[PDB]
Amino acid sequence: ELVNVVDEKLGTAYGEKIDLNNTNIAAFIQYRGLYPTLAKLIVKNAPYESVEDVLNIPGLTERQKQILRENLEHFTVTEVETALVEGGDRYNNGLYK
Amino acid sequence: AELTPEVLTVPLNSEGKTITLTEKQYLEGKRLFQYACASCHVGGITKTNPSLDLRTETLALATPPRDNIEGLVDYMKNPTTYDGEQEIAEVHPSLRSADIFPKMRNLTEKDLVAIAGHILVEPKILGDKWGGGKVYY
Amino acid sequence: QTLTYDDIVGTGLANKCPTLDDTARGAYPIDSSQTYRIARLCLQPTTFLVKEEPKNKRQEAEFVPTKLVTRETTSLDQIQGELKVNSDGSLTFVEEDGIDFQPVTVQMAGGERIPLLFTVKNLVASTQPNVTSITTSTDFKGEFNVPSYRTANFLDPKGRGLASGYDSAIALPQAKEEELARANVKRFSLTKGQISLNVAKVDGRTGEIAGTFESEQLSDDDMGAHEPHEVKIQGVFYASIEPA
Amino acid sequence: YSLGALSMMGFIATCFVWFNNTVYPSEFYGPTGPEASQAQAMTFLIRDQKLGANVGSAQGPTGLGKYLMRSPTGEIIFGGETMRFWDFRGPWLEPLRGPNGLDLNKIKNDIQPWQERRAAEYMTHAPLGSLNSVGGVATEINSVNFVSPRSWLATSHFVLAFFFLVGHLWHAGRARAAAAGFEKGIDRESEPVLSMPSLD
Amino acid sequence: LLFFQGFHNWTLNPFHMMGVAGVLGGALLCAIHGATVENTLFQDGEGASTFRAFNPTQAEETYSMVTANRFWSQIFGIAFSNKRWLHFFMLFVPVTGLWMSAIGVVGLALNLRSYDFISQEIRAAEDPEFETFYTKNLLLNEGIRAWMAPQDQPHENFVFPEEVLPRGNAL
Amino acid sequence: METITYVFIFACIIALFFFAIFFREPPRIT
Amino acid sequence: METLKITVYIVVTFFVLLFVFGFLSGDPARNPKRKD
Amino acid sequence: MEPNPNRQPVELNRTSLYLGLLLILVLALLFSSYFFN
Amino acid sequence: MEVNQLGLIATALFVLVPSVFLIILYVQTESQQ
Amino acid sequence: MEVNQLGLIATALFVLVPSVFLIILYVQTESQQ
Amino acid sequence: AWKGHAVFRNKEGEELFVRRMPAFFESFPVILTDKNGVVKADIPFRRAESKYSFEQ
Amino acid sequence: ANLWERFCNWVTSTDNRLYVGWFGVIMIPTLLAATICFVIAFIAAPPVDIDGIREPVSGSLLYGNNIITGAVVPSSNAIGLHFYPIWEAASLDEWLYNGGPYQLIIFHFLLGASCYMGRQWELSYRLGMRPWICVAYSAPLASAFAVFLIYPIGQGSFSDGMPLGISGTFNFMIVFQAEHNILMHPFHQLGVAGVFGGALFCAMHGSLVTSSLIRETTETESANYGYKFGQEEETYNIVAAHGYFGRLIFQYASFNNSRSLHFFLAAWPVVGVWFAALGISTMAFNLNGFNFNHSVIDAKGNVINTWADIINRANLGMEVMHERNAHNFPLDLA
Numbered sequence A: 001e002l003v004n005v006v007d008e009k010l011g012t013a014y015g016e017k018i019d020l021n022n023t024n025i026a027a028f029i030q031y032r033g034l035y036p037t038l039a040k041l042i043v044k045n046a047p048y049e050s051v052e053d054v055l056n057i058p059g060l061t062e063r064q065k066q067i068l069r070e071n072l073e074h075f076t077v078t079e080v081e082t083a084l085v086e087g088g089d090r091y092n093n094g095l096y097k
Numbered sequence B: 001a002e003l004t005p006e007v008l009t010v011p012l013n014s015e016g017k018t019i020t021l022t023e024k025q026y027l028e029g030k031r032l033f034q035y036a037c038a039s040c041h042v043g044g045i046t047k048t049n050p051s052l053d054l055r056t057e058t059l060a061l062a063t064p065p066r067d068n069i070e071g072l073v074d075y076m077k078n079p080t081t082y083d084g085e086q087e088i089a090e091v092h093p094s095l096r097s098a099d100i101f102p103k104m105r106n107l108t109e110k111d112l113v114a115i116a117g118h119i120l121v122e123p124k125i126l127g128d129k130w131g132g133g134k135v136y137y
Numbered sequence C: 001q002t003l004t005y006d007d008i009v010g011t012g013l014a015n016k017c018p019t020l021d022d023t024a025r026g027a028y029p030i031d032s033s034q035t036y037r038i039a040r041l042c043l044q045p046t047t048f049l050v051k052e053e054p055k056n057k058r059q060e061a062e063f064v065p066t067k068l069v070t071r072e073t074t075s076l077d078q079i080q081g082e083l084k085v086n087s088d089g090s091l092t093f094v095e096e097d098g099i100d101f102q103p104v105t106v107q108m109a110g111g112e113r114i115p116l117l118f119t120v121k122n123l124v125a126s127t128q129p130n131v132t133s134i135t136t137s138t139d140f141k142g143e144f145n146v147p148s149y150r151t152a153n154f155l156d157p158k159g160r161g162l163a164s165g166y167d168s169a170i171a172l173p174q175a176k177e178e179e180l181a182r183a184n185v186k187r188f189s190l191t192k193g194q195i196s197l198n199v200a201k202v203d204g205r206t207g208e209i210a211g212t213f214e215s216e217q218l219s220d221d222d223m224g225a226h227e228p229h230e231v232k233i234q235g236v237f238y239a240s241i242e243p244a
Numbered sequence D: 001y002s003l004g005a006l007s008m009m010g011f012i013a014t015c016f017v018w019f020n021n022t023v024y025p026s027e028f029y030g031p032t033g034p035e036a037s038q039a040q041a042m043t044f045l046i047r048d049q050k051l052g053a054n055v056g057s058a059q060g061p062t063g064l065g066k067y068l069m070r071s072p073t074g075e076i077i078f079g080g081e082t083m084r085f086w087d088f089r090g091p092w093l094e095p096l097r098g099p100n101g102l103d104l105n106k107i108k109n110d111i112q113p114w115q116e117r118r119a120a121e122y123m124t125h126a127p128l129g130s131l132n133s134v135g136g137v138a139t140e141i142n143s144v145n146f147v148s149p150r151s152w153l154a155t156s157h158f159v160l161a162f163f164f165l166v167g168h169l170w171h172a173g174r175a176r177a178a179a180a181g182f183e184k185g186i187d188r189e190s191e192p193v194l195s196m197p198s199l200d
Numbered sequence E: 001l002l003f004f005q006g007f008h009n010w011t012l013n014p015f016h017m018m019g020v021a022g023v024l025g026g027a028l029l030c031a032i033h034g035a036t037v038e039n040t041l042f043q044d045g046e047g048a049s050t051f052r053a054f055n056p057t058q059a060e061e062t063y064s065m066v067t068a069n070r071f072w073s074q075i076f077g078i079a080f081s082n083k084r085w086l087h088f089f090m091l092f093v094p095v096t097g098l099w100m101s102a103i104g105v106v107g108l109a110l111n112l113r114s115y116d117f118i119s120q121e122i123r124a125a126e127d128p129e130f131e132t133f134y135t136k137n138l139l140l141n142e143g144i145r146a147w148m149a150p151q152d153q154p155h156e157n158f159v160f161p162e163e164v165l166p167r168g169n170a171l
Numbered sequence F: 001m002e003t004i005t006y007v008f009i010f011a012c013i014i015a016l017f018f019f020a021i022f023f024r025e026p027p028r029i030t
Numbered sequence G: 001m002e003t004l005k006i007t008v009y010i011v012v013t014f015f016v017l018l019f020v021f022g023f024l025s026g027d028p029a030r031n032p033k034r035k036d
Numbered sequence H: 001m002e003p004n005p006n007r008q009p010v011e012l013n014r015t016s017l018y019l020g021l022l023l024i025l026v027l028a029l030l031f032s033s034y035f036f037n
Numbered sequence I, J: 001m002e003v004n005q006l007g008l009i010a011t012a013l014f015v016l017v018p019s020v021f022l023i024i025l026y027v028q029t030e031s032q033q
Numbered sequence K: 001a002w003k004g005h006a007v008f009r010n011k012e013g014e015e016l017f018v019r020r021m022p023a024f025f026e027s028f029p030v031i032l033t034d035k036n037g038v039v040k041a042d043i044p045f046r047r048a049e050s051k052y053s054f055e056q
Numbered sequence L: 001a002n003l004w005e006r007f008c009n010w011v012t013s014t015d016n017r018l019y020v021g022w023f024g025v026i027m028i029p030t031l032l033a034a035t036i037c038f039v040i041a042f043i044a045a046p047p048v049d050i051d052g053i054r055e056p057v058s059g060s061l062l063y064g065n066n067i068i069t070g071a072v073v074p075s076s077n078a079i080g081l082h083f084y085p086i087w088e089a090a091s092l093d094e095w096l097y098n099g100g101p102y103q104l105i106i107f108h109f110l111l112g113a114s115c116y117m118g119r120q121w122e123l124s125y126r127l128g129m130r131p132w133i134c135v136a137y138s139a140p141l142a143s144a145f146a147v148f149l150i151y152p153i154g155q156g157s158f159s160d161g162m163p164l165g166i167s168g169t170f171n172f173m174i175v176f177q178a179e180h181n182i183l184m185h186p187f188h189q190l191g192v193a194g195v196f197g198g199a200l201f202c203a204m205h206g207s208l209v210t211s212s213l214i215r216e217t218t219e220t221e222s223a224n225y226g227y228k229f230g231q232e233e234e235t236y237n238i239v240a241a242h243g244y245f246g247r248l249i250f251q252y253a254s255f256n257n258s259r260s261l262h263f264f265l266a267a268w269p270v271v272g273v274w275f276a277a278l279g280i281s282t283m284a285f286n287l288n289g290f291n292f293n294h295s296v297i298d299a300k301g302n303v304i305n306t307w308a309d310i311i312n313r314a315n316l317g318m319e320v321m322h323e324r325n326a327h328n329f330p331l332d333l334a
C-alpha cells in the first residue's frame, strides 16, 4: 500500500537523533559547536554508512574531530529519504519561526 | 506580578556571579534594544536568520556562552557565529563595526550592559513568547 | 557587439541558448593528459511532445505535439561540471550545479494541461570511445534524475501534503478512507530520463560547442495521484569547454 | 482645470515615491516595496548558500526555483512571491545581474558584505506598518516604531489626488451649469424635459 | 465577525448575502435618491446656495420628478415614476435585508451553517488538482479556528502544540 | 445540468432587463 | 496576434478620435438654455 | 405610434379549462411511466 | 427502482407548463368585462 | 459534479411556480376593461 | 455496530486520551493527552520539528 | 449639415432611449467588451495560475464551479503589473492559463465605468439639471478602482486584485484583513458607518415619507396610485413627518428642509464610501489598520490580552494559511 515516508521516518532514529543523511541543517543548533561550520561540512559530505564516518570528513581540525566525538551519541544514520533531501530541503526546509 | 529584584537578577559571567539590574536599567535596555536591535530581533527572534533566536537556552549553547551579561557584551563588541568560528562584525552590528552600523556608535558599556540585561530578563518575563515567533503572539 | 541586460530584458532572448556561426565547423582537441570542465551548458527546448495513452492496450500510441502555456520560462542554463577524459578515449560529462530544472506546462488538444519538471539534474552523459577531438559527429548520450515536480512541503487544495499538511480528507469526516487513499497519501517520485546531445557546430578556437538535444522523461504525477505521461523534449544546446 | 491637473499630478507623485529609487533615494526614503521583497530573497539566498546550498538548483515546493527562476521573458530573477518585482533595479542588486538576468557565477562569488548588509537592512525596513506606526506586518507585535516615508508620502498623496479629482468633477460640472445658466436649478416656467418628446 | 467567518463560513450563507444586498442597496438608494433630488431641484430662489429656496409649508414639489425620471431612464434604462413607490422601496430594501440576515443567524445559533458545498468537497477530496476560491477560503477558515481557539475559548483549555498548527510554507 | 440551470436563469434575467427597459409601461405626465 | 494588435489599435484610435473631436464640436453650446 | 388594429382578445372558457386540464393530466398519467422508464 | 433521473422533472414540466398556459388563458377570460 | 439529485426540480419549481403566479395576475389585469 | 471503546497508550504504557471535537469545529486536530492534560502525542501538520508523532 | 454635424447631433441627442453622448462612445464598446468576455470567462474559462506557482485555480462553471464559487480569476503573479493583452500571448491557450481575461475585463470595465460617470454629467448638462449625480457615483467608482487597480499597483501585481466572483471576493476580504487589519483601520470604520448609516437613513427616509402620505386612495387600492407622475403638489406632508420625527428624538434633530434632508441623504453614504475607497487605496501602500498587539502590559511585563490580541490570533491563522505554497521566505512583504 501507500505510506507517508516522512511519517515513517519519524518511526526510526530520525525521530529521536540528528540524522546525518536526512535532517535539516538547522537542527545542528541544538548542540554546542556544530553550527554553522561543522553543520555545513556534515550536510555537504552526506551520506554516511555509520555515524563514525563523520570523523573521516577531509580537512577537519583535531578540535573539530573532538567536537564531533562529543556529539556522536546525538547522531544517527538512516537511508537517504529523497523526500527530505530534494529541493534543497536540508538547507532550507521551509520552516522558520 | 511585579518586576522584582529576583526577576532582574541575571548571570554576569560564566562562573556564576550574578548582577541584579535596576528597573531603570531594564527599562533603558528595552529602549536601546528597540532602538538598535528590534528591527531584526523583535520578540527575541531573528528576522534575517530565524534559526538562531535570543532564548536563554539558545545563548547558553553558543560558543562562547552568551547566556550571561559579559558574554552578550562581548558579542556586542565582537560578534561571532554560533560556534565562535567566524567573526561576523562586517554583517552584524557591533562596537567594532560602528562605522558601517552607525546606531552602534554612541553605545556605552552601561548601554551594552543594559541591552544585555534586557535580553536576559525578557524571557523570564514573557516565557516561551520570547524567541517563539508568531505561534506565541 | 556584446549585449547588456537592458538590451535583452523583455525580448525573450534570455530564454535562448547562444549560437555559433555557420562557419564554425571546426574541431576541439581533447588532450588526454589535461583535465576539462564545462563552464556553461545551456539547453533551450523548442518542441515538447507527450505520448498519448489509448485505452485499448494495443494501437498506435505516438507522441503528440503540444502547446506551451508557461511562456519563455523553459531553458536550462548556467550548468557546470567536470568533463572527464576516460581511459578508453570517451568523454563523460558529470553535471555538478546550475539552473538545471524548469517547471513546464504544455497543453494537449482537449485542453489537458501536462506539467513536467524539464530537467537534467545529476546528468551523467558520455561520448563514444576514441574521440580525441570534439567534432561535429560527437554524441553525448546519458541519463539524469527526474525528482518529483512538487517537493515535500507542497499542500494540495484540501491541505494535504507529504512533509506538511493533513493526512486525510477533513471535509468528509466520516467517509470511507480506502477510496481516498491515493489522494490522501502523497508520494515523492524519483525517475530517470535519457538525453542525447548531438554536436553540430564546434568552435575549434574558443571551445564552444552547440547542437541539438532530445530528452525523454516522465511528467508530473501530482505526488502520486495519477499516472505520469511520457514526454519527449527537443531543442538546441550550447556548451563552452574551459580547460581546468 | 487646475483641479484635474493637480489630481493627475498627485496620482503620478504617489507612484513616483512608491516605485522610483532614483529621485527618491532609498538611503533617505527607505527601500521601496519591490526593493525590500527583492532584498529578502537576496538575504535568504545569501544565508542558505553560506550554509552550503546550491541556490541555482534548489527547487521550491511548487517546483519553481526556491531562490532563482525565470521571468516570463526568461531573465533570471529571484524566486518566491517576489517574482512580481523582477523589474526592480537598485544599486545594491545590479552588480549581480548579467546580460540574461541574475548571474549564478556572480551570485556564488561576488556578493560583497555591503550588499548583504543592505539586503538585510532593506528587508527589515520594508514599507509595511500600522497607522500607529508599528512596523511590519499587521500581525506583528508592538516593538518597532516604523512606517516608511514612502508609505506616508504615497498614501497622503493618493488621498489628496482622489479628493482633488472629486473637486475637479464638482467644479467642472458646476462651471458648465453656471455658464449655461442652470446651476441654481430648473426653471419651472421653461423646464427642458417638458418640451422633449417622450422616450416611449 | 472573524469568528463567524472561521467557524460558520458566514460569508457563504445566502441569508447573509441577502443582508449585504439590503444594506449596500439601501446605502445606494440613500446616495442615489439624495443626489437626484439635489440635482433636479427647481430654481425657487436667487441664491447659489439652494437650501434657502425651500419653504417647509409649500404645497409644491421642490424637485422635478419628470426630469429625474428622464435622466435615469436614459442613463440606466429604468427610473422611478411613482414617488410613493420610490419611498416604499427605500423602506423595503434595508429592512428586508436585515430581516434576511437575522434568519441566517438563527440558523447559526444551531450551527446550521452554509459551510460547505458537498459536490465540491467530493471532487476536491478525490482530485488534488481541483482548486476554487471556495476551497481556498476553507483553508483560511481552518487557520482561523486553530490559531484563535485557544485564547478565544480559554474554558476549553486548548493546548494545540505548534506542530499541529495548520500553516503554509515559510509563514 | 447545473451549468445549464445557472446560464438559463442568467439568460432569463438578461431577457427581463430587455423587456423592463424597452417594453416598460411608459411613464405618462398627467 | 499582430493582426489582432493592429485591429484593436485601429479600433481604439477610432473611438478615441470620436471622443476628442466630438467634445471639440462646440460641446458647451449643446444644452437647453444658453445655446451660444 | 397608433395601435395595431389586427389585435383580438383571446378566450378560454371554463369547460375548455376543464377539458384541457383533463387532457394534460391524463397524458401525464399515461406518459410518466415511460418518462421514468 | 432505478428510474430515469430526468423522469421527475420531465413529468413535472409536462404537467405544469401546459396547465399554467390554460390557467393564464382562463383567468384573463374571466377578468374581461 | 455529484450534485443533489433533487436540486434541478427544486430550482425549476422555485422559478416557475411564483413566476407563473405573477404572469397569471398580470395578464388578467391587462384583459380587464 | 459499536467498535468498542478505544484506549490509546504510548510506548511507556501510559494511557492517552484523544481531545474530543467541540461542536463549533468543522475539523479538529488529533491531540492525545495524559490524565493530567499534558500533551503526549498528536498528528502533526508540519513534520520537520515534530516531537509528538504516534511513530515517535 | 454635413455628416459630422448630423453625427454629433445624434450622439448627443436627448431623444435617444438610452443616452449615447461622447462619454458613451467610449462607455458602450468598453462595457460590451468587458461584459462579453466576463460572461464567456465565467462560463467556460480554463483554470488560471493566479499565484504564479503553476497551481491553477478553477474559476468557470464548466470546470466545476457554481454561481457562488465561480470567478474570473486574477492574472498570474508572474505577470505582476505587466500589461497582458491577447497579442502579448503566444496563443489563446497561454493567455487563458495566465489569467488574460481578468486584465481585459477590469481594464475595459474601469474605462467604461469612468465614462459612465462622465455620461452622468453629460446628460444632466443636456437636460438642464444640476451636475452632481456623477459626484455621488464617484463613491462606488473609486471603490472599484481601489480593489481592481489601486490595490494591485501598490502590491505590485494584478494577482492581488479582487477576483470577479462571489467566493473570490470573500477570499480578497479575508486575506486583506490578514495583511492589513482593515477592521482596525478608521477609513473602513468610516466606510461601515457610511453603509450602515446609508441603510438606516434609507429606511428612515422611506418610512417617514410613507408614514406621512396624504390620503388619496381607498382601502381596496394601493396607496401608490395616490401619486400621479408629474403632479405638482407634494405627495406627503413634510410638516407632519417633521412633527413626528422631531418628537421621536427632539425637534432640532429633525429636518424641516427637504433640500437639507436630501443633501444629507446624498452626503452621508458618499463620504463614507469615499473613505472606504481611500481605506483600500492607502492600505495598498501598506499603511495598515491600528496595531494594538501586546499594548497592555502588567507591572511585571506580562502581556495582558485584549480583544485586539484575539483579532490578531484570527489574522495569524488567515496569514499562515493563505496562498499556502507561494511563500519561500519568512515575511509576506507584498
Ligand code: CLA
Pocket: D131, D133, D149, D152, D153, D156, D157, D159, D163, L271
Ligand atoms: C503630505 C502631507 C504629509 C505627510 C506624508 C506627513 C507624514 C508624516 N508626518 Mg507630518 N505634517 C503634515 C503633513 C504630512 N505629514 C501637516 C499638514 C502637519 C501639521 C499638522 C504635519 C505636522 C507633523 C508633526 C508635528 C509630526 C508629523 C509627523 C509625520 C510622520 C508620522 C505621521 C503620523 O503618525 O500620522 C498620524 C496619522 C494621522 C493624524 C491620521 C491622518 C488622517 C488624515 C487626517 C485624513 C485626511 C483625509 C482628508 C484630506 C480629510 C477629510 C476631508 C474630506 C471630507 C474631503 C509622517 C512622516 C510626526 C513625525 O514623525 O515627525 C518627525 C510628527 O511628530 N507631521
Ligand code: CLA
Pocket: D006, D007, D009, D010, D011, D013, D014, D016, D017, D153, D154, D157, D160, D161, D164
Ligand atoms: C496638506 C497639504 C500638503 C502638504 C503638507 C504637502 C507636502 C508635500 N508634497 Mg504635496 N500636494 C498636495 C498637498 C500637500 N502636499 C495637494 C493637495 C496636491 C495635489 C493633489 C499635492 C501634489 C504634490 C505632487 C505632485 C508632489 C507633492 C510632493 C510633496 C512633498 C514635497 C513638496 C515640494 O517640494 O513641492 C515643490 C515646491 C515648489 C513647487 C515650490 C517652488 C520650489 C522651487 C522651484 C525649488 C527650487 C530648488 C532648487 C534646488 C534651487 C537651487 C538654487 C541654486 C541656484 C543653488 C511634500 C511632503 C512631492 C512628493 O514628494 O511626492 C510624493 C510631489 O512630487 N505634492
Ligand code: CLA
Pocket: D001, D004, D005, D007, D008, D168, D169, D171, D172, D173, D175, D176, G012, G015, G016, G019, G020, G023, L026, L111, L114, L115, L117, L118, L121
Ligand atoms: C474620471 C475622469 C474624468 C471625468 C469623468 C471628467 C469629466 C469632465 N471633465 Mg475632466 N479632466 C480630468 C478627469 C475627468 N474629467 C483630468 C484628470 C483632467 C486633467 C488632465 C481633466 C481636465 C479637464 C479639462 C481641461 C476640462 C474637463 C472638463 C470635464 C467636463 C466636461 C466633459 C469633458 O470635456 O471632459 C473631457 C474628459 C477628460 C478631460 C478626461 C476623461 C477621462 C475618462 C476616463 C474618459 C476617457 C476617454 C478617452 C477617449 C479614453 C482613452 C482610451 C485609451 C485606451 C486611449 C466633465 C464633467 C471640461 C469642462 O467642462 O470643465 C469646466 C474641460 O474643459 N476636464
Ligand code: CLA
Pocket: E001, E002, E004, E005, E009, E010, E011, E016, E019, E020, E023, E024, E097, E098, E101, E102, E103, E105, L173, L195, L196
Ligand atoms: C460587504 C460588506 C458587508 C456588509 C454590507 C455586511 C452587512 C451586514 N452584516 Mg456582515 N459581515 C461581513 C461583510 C458585510 N456584512 C463579512 C466579510 C463578515 C465575516 C464573515 C461579516 C460577519 C457578520 C456577522 C457576525 C454579522 C454580520 C451582520 C450583518 C448585518 C448587520 C446589520 C446591522 O446593521 O446590525 C447592527 C445592529 C443592529 C441593527 C441592532 C440594533 C442596534 C440598536 C438600534 C442601536 C442603538 C444605539 C444606541 C441608541 C446607543 C449607541 C451609543 C454609541 C456611543 C455606541 C448587515 C446585513 C450581523 C447579522 O447578520 O445580524 C443578523 C451579524 O451578526 N456580518
Ligand SMILES: CC(C)=CCC/C(C)=C/CC/C(C)=C/CC/C(C)=C/CC/C(C)=C/CC/C(C)=C/CC/C(C)=C/CC/C(C)=C/CC/C(C)=C/CC1=CC(=O)C(C)=C(C)C1=O
Pocket: E017, E018, E019, E021, E022, E025, E026, E028, E029, E032, E033, E034, E036, E037, E065, E068, E069, E072, E073, E076, E078, E079, E080, E081, E092, E093, E094, E096, E097, E100, F006, F007, F010, L039, L042, L043, L067, L165, L166
Ligand atoms: C451565468 C452567469 C454569467 C452568472 C452571473 C454571475 C454572477 C456572479 C451573478 C451574480 C449573482 C447575484 C446577482 C447574486 C446576488 C443575489 C442577492 C444577494 C440577492 C438579494 C436578494 C434579496 C431579496 C435581498 C433582500 C434585500 C433587497 C430586497 C435588496 C434589493 C436591493 C436593490 C435591488 C436595490 C436597488 C438598486 C438599484 C440600482 C436601484 C436604482 C433605482 C433607481 C433607478 C433610482 C433612480 C432614481 C432616483 C430618484 O431619486 C428619483 C427621484 C428617480 C425618479 C429615479 O429614477
Ligand SMILES: CC(C)=CCC/C(C)=C/CC/C(C)=C/CC/C(C)=C/CC/C(C)=C/CC/C(C)=C/CC/C(C)=C/CC/C(C)=C/CC/C(C)=C/CC1=CC(=O)C(C)=C(C)C1=O
Pocket: L201, L204, L205, L206, L208, L209, L238, L241, L242, L245, L246, L249, L253, L254, L255, L256, L261, L264, L265
Ligand atoms: C423607572 C424610571 C425611573 C422611569 C422614569 C422614566 C422617565 C419618565 C424619564 C423621563 C426623563 C428623561 C427623558 C430621562 C432621560 C433619560 C435618558 C437620558 C435616556 C437615555 C436615552 C438615550 C440612550 C438617548 C437616545 C439616543 C438617541 C436616539 C440619540 C441619537 C439622535 C439622532 C440619531 C440624531 C441625529 C439625527 C439625524 C440627523 C438623522 C436623520 C435621519 C434621517 C436621514 C431621517 C430622514 C428624515 C428626517 C426628517 O426629519 C424628515 C422630516 C423626513 C421626511 C425624513 O425623511
Ligand code: HEC
Pocket: B033, B036, B037, B038, B039, B040, B041, B046, B048, B049, B052, B053, B054, B058, B059, B062, B066, B072, B075, B076, B080, B081, B082, B088, B092, B093, B115, D120, D121, D124
Ligand atoms: C539584522 C539586521 C540585525 C540587527 C539590527 C541585529 N542583529 Fe543580532 N543577529 C542577527 C543575525 C542575522 C544573527 C545570526 C548571525 C549568525 O550567527 O549567522 C544575529 C545573532 C545575534 C545573537 C546570537 C544569538 C544566539 O543564538 O547566540 C545575539 C546575542 C544578537 N544577535 C544580539 C543583537 C543585539 C544585542 C543587537 C542590537 C545591538 C543586534 N543583535 C542587532 C541580526 C541582527
Ligand SMILES: CCCCCCCCCCCCO[C@@H]1O[C@H](CO)[C@@H](O[C@H]2O[C@H](CO)[C@@H](O)[C@H](O)[C@H]2O)[C@H](O)[C@H]1O
Pocket: G020, G024, G025, G026, G027, G029, L004, L005, L006, L008, L009
Ligand atoms: C487628438 C487629435 C486632434 C487634436 C486636436 C487639436 C486641435 C484642435 C482643433 C481642431 C479643430 C477643432 O475645431 C472644431 O472643429 C469642429 C468640427 O467641425 C467645428 O465644427 C463644429 O461646429 C459646431 C460647433 O459649434 C458643431 O455644432 C458641429 O457639429 C461641428 O461641425 C468646431 O466649431 C471647431 O471648434
Ligand SMILES: CCCCCCCCCCCCO[C@@H]1O[C@H](CO)[C@@H](O[C@H]2O[C@H](CO)[C@@H](O)[C@H](O)[C@H]2O)[C@H](O)[C@H]1O
Pocket: H008, H009, H010, H011, I016, I017, I018, I020, I021, I024, I028, I032, I033, J020, J023, J027, J030, J031, J032, J033
Ligand atoms: C410556462 C408557460 C407560460 C405561457 C405563458 C402564456 C402567455 C399567454 C399570453 C396571453 C396574453 C393575452 O394578452 C392579453 O389579451 C387580452 C385579451 O385576451 C387583452 O385585453 C384586451 O381585450 C380585453 C377584452 O376585449 C379588454 O377587456 C382589455 O381592456 C384589452 O386590453 C390584453 O391587453 C392582452 O395583454
Ligand code: OEX
Pocket: D081, L051, L077, L155, L159, L160, L175, L179, L322, L323, L326, L332, L333, L334
Ligand atoms: O498574492 Mn495574493 O496575498 Ca498580497 O501578501 Mn504576499 O502576495 Mn500573496 O502573499 Mn499575502
Ligand SMILES: [Cl-]
Pocket: E136, E137, E140, L171, L175, L321, L322, L323, L324
Ligand atoms: Cl488564499
Ligand SMILES: [Cl-]
Pocket: D079, D080, D081, D082, L326, L327, L328, L329
Ligand atoms: Cl516568498
Ligand SMILES: [Fe+2]
Pocket: E033, E037, E087, L205, L209, L262
Ligand atoms: Fe425623498
